[PDB]
Design a protein around this ligand. Structure first.
Ligand SMILES: [Mg+2]
Ligand SMILES: [Mg+2]
Length: 302
């Protein structure tokens, strides 16, 4: 059986106390992601955190275990909590667990509720410690592996990208548009030639991007990105993050494009048209799941 080296040392110095502790790989730290649309904060993913609670040897009776918010532990961890507010206690809901007589593991749940108005961009931080309800003989919470740290990272993202893939009803153009990219810059001339079905430019990883540079500030309705027509979805654009450079020079995430219709013409539409100087597509994923997409032609709409 696998036993962690730190609690194996405790069992060596005192083999007459079964230890109850937190089961986790690596460090006791989870960075949760949330997004704000200048109205409400939303968690990216599940709002529940399930923690494994282990006991070193099967115990004679049931052990009730639970987590609690001990904010004092954040003070001795200043690397992550330097000037970051505490996650409010009222927004935590702790569900207990029971290591039933004979069992070696159980789970304890931390549920984050009503985060909507928690809009601090610095994020929030919190510390939690494992506890036992009653008094059990020759049983204790381990010295180490008894506390955990959670950071809620917050970032702005508007819900201004429509992924319906419906044809854009605007006035199309691309002669005056210029393009910049970190990969294959020499092949960007194909993005505004006459050809919609031939490929020259494509991404090779999630860190590649494609920037659309307009001649001047102008209100755009969306874009038509011609992509691959593979039946398997290889190199066919499925999803991407749409960054927009505003007139003051700040870059804002207008949302995630993530279509459900498979074809060679991707229509990325702004729910509310936006005045911008540049638009940058990032984290471009194909329908086959690989981060490599074809862009055969780019057309903007006013
Ligand atoms: Mg159970
Ligand atoms: Mg072309």
């Amino acid at each position: 059986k696998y036993i962690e080296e730190d609690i194996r040392e405790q069992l060596g110095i005192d083999p007459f106390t079964d230890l109850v502790y937190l089961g986790y790989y690596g460090n006791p730290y989870t960075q949760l992601e949330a997004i704000n649309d200048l109205v409400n904060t939303t968690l990216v993913g599940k709002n529940e955190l399930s923690f494994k609670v282990k006991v070193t040897k099967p115990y004679k009776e049931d052990i009730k275990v639970n987590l609690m918010k001990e904010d004092k532990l954040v003070t001795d961890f200043p690397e992550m909590a330097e000037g970051i507010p505490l996650f409010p206690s009222e927004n935590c809901t702790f569900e207990g667990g029971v290591l039933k007589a004979g069992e070696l593991e159980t789970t304890v749940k931390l549920t984050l509720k009503d985060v909507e108005k928690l809009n601090n961009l610095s994020g929030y931080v919190m510390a939690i410690k494992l506890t036992m309800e009653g008094s059990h003989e020759h049983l204790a919470i381990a010295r180490t592996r008894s506390s955990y740290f959670v950071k809620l990272n917050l970032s702005i993202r508007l819900d201004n990208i429509d992924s319906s893939n419906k044809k854009i009803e605007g006035k199309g153009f691309n002669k005056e548009i210029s393009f910049k990219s970190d990969i294959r810059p020499d092949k960007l001339g194909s993005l505004n030639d006459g050809n919609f079905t031939a490929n020259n430019w494509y991404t090779s990883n999630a860190n590649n991007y494609l920037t659309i540079i307009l001649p001047e500030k102008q209100s755009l309705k969306g874009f038509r990105l011609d992509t691959n027509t593979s039946p398997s979805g290889s190199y066919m654009l499925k999803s991407c993050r749409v960054m927009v450079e505003t007139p003051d020079g700040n870059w804002v995430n207008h949302g995630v494009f993530d279509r459900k219709s498979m074809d060679g013409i991707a229509y990325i539409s702004f729910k509310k048209p936006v005045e911008c100087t540049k638009v940058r597509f990032e984290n471009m994923m194909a329908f086959n799941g690989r981060f490599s997409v074809d862009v055969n032609e780019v057309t903007a709409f006013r």
